[PDB]
RNA sequence: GUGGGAGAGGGUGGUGGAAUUCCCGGAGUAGCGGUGAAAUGCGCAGAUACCGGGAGGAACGCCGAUGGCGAAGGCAGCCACCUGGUCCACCCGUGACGCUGAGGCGCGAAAGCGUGGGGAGCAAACCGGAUUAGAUACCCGGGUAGUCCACGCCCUAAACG
RNA sequence: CCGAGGGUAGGGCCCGUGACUGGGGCGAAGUCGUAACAAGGUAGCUGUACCGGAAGGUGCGGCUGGA
RNA sequence: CGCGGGGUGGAGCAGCCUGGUAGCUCGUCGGGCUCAUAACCCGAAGGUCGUCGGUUCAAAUCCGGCCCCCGCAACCA
RNA sequence: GUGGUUCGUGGAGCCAUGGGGGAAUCUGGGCGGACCACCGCCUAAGGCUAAGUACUCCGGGUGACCGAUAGCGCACCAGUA
RNA sequence: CGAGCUAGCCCUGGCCAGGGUGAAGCUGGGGUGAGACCCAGUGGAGGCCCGAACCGGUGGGGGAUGCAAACCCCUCGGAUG
RNA sequence: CGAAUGCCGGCAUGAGUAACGAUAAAGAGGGUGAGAAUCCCUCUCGCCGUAAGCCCAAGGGUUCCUACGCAAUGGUCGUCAGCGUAGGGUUAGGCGGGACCUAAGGUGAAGCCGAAAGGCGUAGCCGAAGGGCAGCCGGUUAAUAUUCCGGCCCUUCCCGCAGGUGCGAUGGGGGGACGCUCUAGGCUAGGGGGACCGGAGCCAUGGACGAGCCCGGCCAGAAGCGCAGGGUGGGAGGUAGGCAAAUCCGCCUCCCAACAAGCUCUGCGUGGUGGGGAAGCCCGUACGGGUGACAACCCCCCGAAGCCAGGGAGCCAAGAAAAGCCUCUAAGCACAACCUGCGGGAACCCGUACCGCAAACCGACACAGGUGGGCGGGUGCAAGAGCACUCAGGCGCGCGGGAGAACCCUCGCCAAGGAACUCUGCAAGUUGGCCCCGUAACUUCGGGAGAAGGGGUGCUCCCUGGGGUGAUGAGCCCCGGGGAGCCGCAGUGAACAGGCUCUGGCGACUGUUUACCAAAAACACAGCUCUCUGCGAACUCGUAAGAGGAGGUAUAGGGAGCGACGCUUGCCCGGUGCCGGAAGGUCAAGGGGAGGGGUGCAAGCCCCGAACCGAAGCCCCGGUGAACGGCGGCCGUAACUAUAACGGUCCUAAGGUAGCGAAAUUCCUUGUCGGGUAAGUUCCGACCUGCACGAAAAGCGUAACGACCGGAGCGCUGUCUCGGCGAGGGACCCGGUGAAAUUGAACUGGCCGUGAAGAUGCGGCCUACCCGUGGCAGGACGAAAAGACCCCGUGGAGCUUUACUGCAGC
């Protein structure tokens, strides 16, 4: 039947976005944690124009 | 009036509608005065805080004059008559001399082409609006205000009315549509008369549907659910509560009273 | 026809005083209610009795009759509008147009039923208190429909002269 | 083609029978009470309504076949 | 089988738990009123207390054994 | 009414303080564990002040520390696949 | 950290072949004092019926290291709400 | 290190076993090649064809196209590829988005709140398949085109000239601008027919040179008309409203229209012109090209769900906003500006390949699953997006060849009986579409109803009645009615297309639910009642601010229960609850201080502290059951027995009424009596001894409604006696690819004993050459899961109250 992964570009770069994750205090440390882990994306790659 | 139906379909016949014939070809609401977005919602922000609610058909504003001091003295002649799917009470469009359109909560006896008029002057009759004290102690009138420049607030739910019944210094002794005394001050304005349509208490909604329209989804009792979400809850076949009757949130609801005891506005009431 | 006459005939609107019940205040105590006698109940948490003030509904004392009106059932404070019947006089108009009335249609106390209002007093049922051998009664204190209004049904009667 | 009748299916009336049921009529000396007739010891009678072992009682209105 | 409740004049009930004292309503018997019966009035009679044991000076009453009676439980499988 | 102190209401002081009352300027105030006397110590309700002290992303040294299933998860283009 | 599955609400758009059945209201006639009402004709009402898409998930079979971590076949519910 | 259902890795085992992913199907000749069932070509055959065919959007991100290639990826093969290597490939003022607008909702200056982080928040900003807005038809490429080009037609800016007019706002108005079902008239898309036009061809096989067969007969296109159709009154006075102003808007009052007459505004034709253009045939493709061609480009009919569109009619639930657009004026400026023509000039940024009901998206896979919108031809069946065949177009689902066992899946058929099968007609059949007869109880007058039960249904000729498009006709297209006749076993001849009935229970009904074992008698539901709430309402979320409630106001809103409708809902307020009681009893801080205590030499300072005054709360006094609840026992009695209308006594707060009753409630129980039956622990009707119904956790009913749950008939039948035959897909044999749970090691026989009590393994005897293959499942206390029942642990959570102890809240 139907599954759970429905593909968007909108609602992903609006969720878990970068400007998502900056506008509040725990996305902010997401962030933090992400960086100084690493991480080579510390965002999703959400894409096209 | 009130309309029926022959049993053509179970429900479609215990269905009864209302009649809009004291409708004047009206029907087209008319813009500028009113109508606005009405922002349709059944929670604040987040949360739903009244249960039940949501769907049923689209609305638009009917934006009312509810304080008539507006026009002290400007006559208006009474132009149409229309539906106001914010209330119960059908309402009157009319056409002042000023040039200026509004709507008032139309009175039981108004008729289209009649001329109204609001003030310390204006003659008591259907329609007209004065304040408290320059009111004949005795008629009947709808849409009193509570506190001067306030707004009506009083008998405005379909054929309602207050009656008046004595004077007391600054102050008028009302007869609710509840059956409370209270004393309201001279200063408030009532336009004169009964609400009308007072037939809306007869309609027999029919279906299941016909609810869901005015937008009220079902409403399951506690005793339906668990312990966990309500008292009345489980746990074999059905039960007897089991315990005073109570809300979903727990409190008496068979009889404990409400009112916030100490408040101010007690002294100006006298019933129940 | 013309011209008048009496009447609680009918409907709808509006209003007036008497008394009851409750409410508020005054003042005022040790009992009031009720019966054949009492008991329940009511009262020092201020009763009963009295005065002032306010709400609400129902019914209209004297006139009032052994009277009147209505086809009947029935109709009783006052005012107004709409309305039917009914008698008198004048002997003008019509010109036999008259009577009864199977069915039909309509009205139709009361209780009762529907929906909505209203609810002072009364009061089926019902709770008590007496009475009795026992009382589901007659008697007493409570008291719900009902009683009253709108509209809709119900068509009964010792509807009797 | 019609057509006596034969088979199918569904209706209408009447007749008989049926556990139990409902009241009834009748049956010399069974039980409980005492409703009515004298003011029947609550005048009765009534239509309706609720109620009660039973008679009956009560309400609302009516009637004289009572005062 | 198990839990607890109960056997009292003819009928239905008290009386114990703080042992010595059996009480009430009806019914039954005798007498009255009435023509007579009921009602009402005046008096009177009747109880090995389920039974076999002992506990104490003394048991309806305290304690164990059986005879019926009533009610409650007989769950997980 | 509470917190801090070893202090959990305890005879419960001191240090702080939301609440209410509500001063004094040296013969003025707080403390020395209820309180009082005596004898003493300090001078609140304004602020700053290096040094010794902590830490190791980075650089260096040294190991009775590992030696590729160990040693950081990663000796290898790993916080990747 | 998650309402891209799922539940509910909000704003905004989209979708439902083709058949049946015949409501009220009209129009004519009948009727009466005027009515109630009765007939026709029109009319197209409905949490209306039949039934595709679509939305489901009744009964049985198969599938059960499957085609599938909810499947398939037969059948069945609703489908202007 | 020998064990931890231990950790990581490696390799065995089952095993050449099961599988190889739809039962829509393949056969052959000819190329390429080291190698072809699998690649390319051709011929033949089968599947889809409201798609398995085309077009968008989402998602995907190089998968598109060429050349060169098979190591791996492909469930086999592979020269093929969605694969590996390389290069090429997407072109926009008009399509889509943005330099336009606004909705929910975000964000957010002013402000408001919160220990901080942060929370609210009218303006404004953001916010999109919603409003606004300017491109159609063809051609070319190996790959892109509404993009390039070709033809025709537009949109804005900016700059000039020609003039018109007081121009002029982020401000005022107008408009934009709206529901649902049903529809009118005219159109186009789409389709059918043609004796007419235009076409390579073709006379087969017995007949046919024929109005013969086959193929095709348009597309776009401004102004100008013409045909539809939408919008709209025109003047003048007065004007206090439209938050400054208006000449505009509204509101009055006099004239003229009431008509679409007249302006406009679209759709449709016609249109200068531009373009396309079948079959067959020749070729060479991996495909396209050439010819057919000066191709014709004609007339009728069907016909929209689309267009005119802001069309109308009806209805109740009463149906976005802002901007563009017009209009109106203000500060300002009127040598500005703005409006109308004509020219020139200027016009950015992003998307375009390809997949796209799928092998390129979501499911670890080339996964029978899921995925919004548009097109979806023809014939026939009453209609239809249905069904069957088929256009166009695309597939034969990426392992094959055999064989023709059991058994499995799926499917067909049956003698005679027919439900005897069985928990149960479960499953399977029967019926089946349309037309016309003809339809019962009961009923809430609708219904039940497709009741039930029947006949008709194909072709041929003859006669005859309607319409519609055309003129009142021909044709073409729809409905008909009658009458003769013909052929079959059979005429909705194939596909799609109810089995019917009686009866009871349960619920009113349509609806809803446990995604993934429960679709119901559960939930919801209109309706019924109680109760709270006077408005800064009650109530709920939040610490607050605030918001919902509600821009609502007692005919309104919150809670609770019952659950359409009919008939009805009895007694108990003693307890618990809530409601009412300005009296009393008790009651904390505090107020009050009689009095006592510690120090001082004293003033003092510092502690205790009885009266008394002190709220709600409880106690106390009443109301109240559609509030929490409850609603008896033991005797006796009637002139046959029997039974008890009557009585007696005890305890209650009061002593369950009507109605129903072996029940969805009944233990004893298959109670007992009747019916159905050959026989009936079920069913149905009765009785009442109701273990243990009973009145809003409603009582007894009720037409209708049901994938609910029993009982019964008729019909039909493979369910069965009791099976048999047949088909296909597996099963089996061959080639290819080739797993899995499990596994202390194995050289793993029967009885009878024994053993921790169920022995291949010990004892005694009996039996038994070695190794496979198909099958059956009794055993290996067979696999699977540290048993989910149970008990244990002073283990864990979920839930309740008059458990304890707090907290919110009041
Ligand atoms: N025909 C009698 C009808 O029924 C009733 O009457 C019936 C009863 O009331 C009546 O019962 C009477 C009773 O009144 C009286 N107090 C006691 C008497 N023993 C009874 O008598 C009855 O029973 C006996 C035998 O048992 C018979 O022989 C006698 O005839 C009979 N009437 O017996 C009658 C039937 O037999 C009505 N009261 C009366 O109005 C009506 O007419
Ligand atoms: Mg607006
Ligand atoms: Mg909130
Ligand atoms: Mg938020
Ligand atoms: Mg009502
Ligand atoms: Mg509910
Ligand atoms: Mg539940
Ligand atoms: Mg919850
Ligand atoms: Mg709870
Ligand atoms: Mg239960
Ligand atoms: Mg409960
Ligand atoms: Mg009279
Ligand atoms: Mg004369
Ligand atoms: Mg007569
Ligand atoms: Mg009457
Ligand atoms: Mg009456
Ligand atoms: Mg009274
Ligand atoms: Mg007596
Ligand atoms: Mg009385
Ligand atoms: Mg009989
Ligand atoms: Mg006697
Ligand atoms: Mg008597
Ligand atoms: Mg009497
Ligand atoms: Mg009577
Ligand atoms: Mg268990
Ligand atoms: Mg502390
Ligand atoms: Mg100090
Ligand atoms: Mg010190
Ligand atoms: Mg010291
Ligand atoms: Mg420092
Ligand atoms: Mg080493
Ligand atoms: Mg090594
Ligand atoms: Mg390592
Ligand atoms: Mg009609
Ligand atoms: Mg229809
Ligand atoms: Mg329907
Ligand atoms: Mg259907
Ligand atoms: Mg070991
Ligand atoms: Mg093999
Ligand atoms: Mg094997
Ligand atoms: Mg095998
Ligand atoms: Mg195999
Ligand atoms: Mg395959
Ligand atoms: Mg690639
Ligand atoms: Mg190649
Ligand atoms: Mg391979
Ligand atoms: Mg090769
Ligand atoms: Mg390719
Ligand atoms: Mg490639
Ligand atoms: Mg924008
Ligand atoms: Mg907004
Ligand atoms: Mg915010
Ligand atoms: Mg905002
Ligand atoms: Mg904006
Ligand atoms: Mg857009
Ligand atoms: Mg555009
Ligand atoms: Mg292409
Ligand atoms: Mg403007
Ligand atoms: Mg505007
Ligand atoms: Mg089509
Ligand atoms: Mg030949
Ligand atoms: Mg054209
Ligand atoms: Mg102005
Ligand atoms: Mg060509
Ligand atoms: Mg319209
Ligand atoms: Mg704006
Ligand atoms: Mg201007
Ligand atoms: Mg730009
Ligand atoms: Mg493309
Ligand atoms: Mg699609
Ligand atoms: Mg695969
Ligand atoms: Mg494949
Ligand atoms: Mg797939
Ligand atoms: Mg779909
Ligand atoms: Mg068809
Ligand atoms: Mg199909
Ligand atoms: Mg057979
Ligand atoms: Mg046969
Ligand atoms: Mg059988
Ligand atoms: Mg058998
Ligand atoms: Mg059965
Ligand atoms: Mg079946
Ligand atoms: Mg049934
Ligand atoms: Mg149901
Ligand atoms: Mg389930
Ligand atoms: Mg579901
Ligand atoms: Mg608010
Ligand atoms: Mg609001
Ligand atoms: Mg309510
Ligand atoms: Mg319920
Ligand atoms: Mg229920
Ligand atoms: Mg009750
Ligand atoms: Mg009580
Ligand atoms: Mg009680
Ligand atoms: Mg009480
Ligand atoms: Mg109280
Ligand atoms: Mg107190
Ligand atoms: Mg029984
Ligand atoms: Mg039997
Ligand atoms: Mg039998
Ligand atoms: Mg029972
Ligand atoms: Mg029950
Ligand atoms: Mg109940
Ligand atoms: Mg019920
Ligand atoms: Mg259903
Ligand atoms: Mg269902
Ligand atoms: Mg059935
Ligand atoms: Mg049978
Ligand atoms: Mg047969
Ligand atoms: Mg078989
Ligand atoms: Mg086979
Ligand atoms: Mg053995
Ligand atoms: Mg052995
Ligand atoms: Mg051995
Ligand atoms: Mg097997
Ligand atoms: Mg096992
Ligand atoms: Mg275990
Ligand atoms: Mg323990
Ligand atoms: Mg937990």
């Known amino acids: 039947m139907k599954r759970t992964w429905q593909p968007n570009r909108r609602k992903r770069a609006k969720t878990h976005g970068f400007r998502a994750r900056m506008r509040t205090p725990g996305g902010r440390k997401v962030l933090k944690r992400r960086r100084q882990k690493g991480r080579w994306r510390l965002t999703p790659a959400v894409r096209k124009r | 009036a009130v309309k029926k139906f022959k049993p053509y379909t179970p429900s479609r016949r215990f269905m009864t509608v209302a009649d809009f014939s004291e409708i004047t070809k009206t029907e ?6 009113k109508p606005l977005k009405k922002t349709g919602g059944r929670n604040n922000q987040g949360r739903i805080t009244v ?3 949501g769907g049923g058909h689209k609305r638009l504003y009917r934006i ?56 310390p002057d204006a003659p008591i009759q259907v329609g007209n ?8 102690v005795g008629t009947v009138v709808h849409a009193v205000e509570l506190e001067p420049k306030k707004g009506a607030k009083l008998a405005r739910a379909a054929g309602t009315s207050a009656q ?19 004393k309201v001050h001279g200063e408030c304005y009532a336009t004169v008369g009964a609400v009308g349509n007072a037939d809306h208490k007869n309609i027999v909604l029919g279906k299941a549907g016909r609810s869901r329209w005015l937008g009220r989804r079902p ?54």
């Open chain 2, 28 to 33: 087209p609401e008319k813009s500028l005065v």
């Open chain 2, 51 to 53: 249960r039940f609610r």
């Open chain 2, 64 to 119: 009312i004059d509810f304080k008539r001091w507006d026009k002290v003295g400007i006559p208006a002649k009474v132009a149409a008559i229309e539906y106001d799917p914010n209330r119960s009470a059908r309402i009157a469009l009319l056409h002042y001399v000023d040039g200026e359109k509004r709507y008032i909560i139309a009175p039981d006896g108004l008729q289209v082409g009649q001329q109204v008029v609001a003030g």
């Open chain 2, 129 to 136: 609006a004065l304040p408290l004290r320059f009111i004949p």
């Open chain 2, 164 to 182: 008046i019944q004595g004077r007391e210094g600054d102050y008028v002794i009302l007869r609710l549509p509840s059956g409370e005394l209270r």
């Open chain 2, 219 to 272: 409403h399951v009792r506690g005793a339906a659910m668990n312990p966990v979400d309500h008292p009345h809850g489980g746990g074999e076949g059905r039960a007897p509560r089991g315990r005073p009757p109570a809300s979903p949130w727990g409190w008496q609801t068979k009889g404990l009273k409400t009112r916030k005891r100490r408040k101010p506005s007690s002294r100006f009431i006298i019933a129940r």
